[PDB]
């Protein structure tokens, strides 16, 4: 429900977004406002936005 996995690698193009690799796990913190979600990376602990078409629920 709130734990998601990256399906593809992604390199951030803004200071606000996270970069990640395929298979990295995230905790979602706010998915209410649009199709970019606020998340916390379970590898780095960093929080920022991720594109929701790049992740799926575990």
């Amino acid at each position: 429900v709130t734990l998601f996995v990256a399906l593809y690698d992604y390199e951030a193009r803004t200071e606000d977004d996270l970069s990640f690799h395929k298979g990295e796990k995230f905790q979602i913190l706010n998915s209410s406002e649009g199709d970019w979600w606020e998340a916390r990376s379970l590898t780095t602990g960093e929080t920022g936005y991720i594109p929701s078409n790049y992740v799926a629920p575990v």
Partner: peptide
């Protein structure tokens, strides 16, 4: 706002 930007294409 950051949430409502267009999504990137899938690879």
């Amino acid at each position: 706002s950051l949430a409502r930007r267009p999504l990137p294409p899938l690879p």
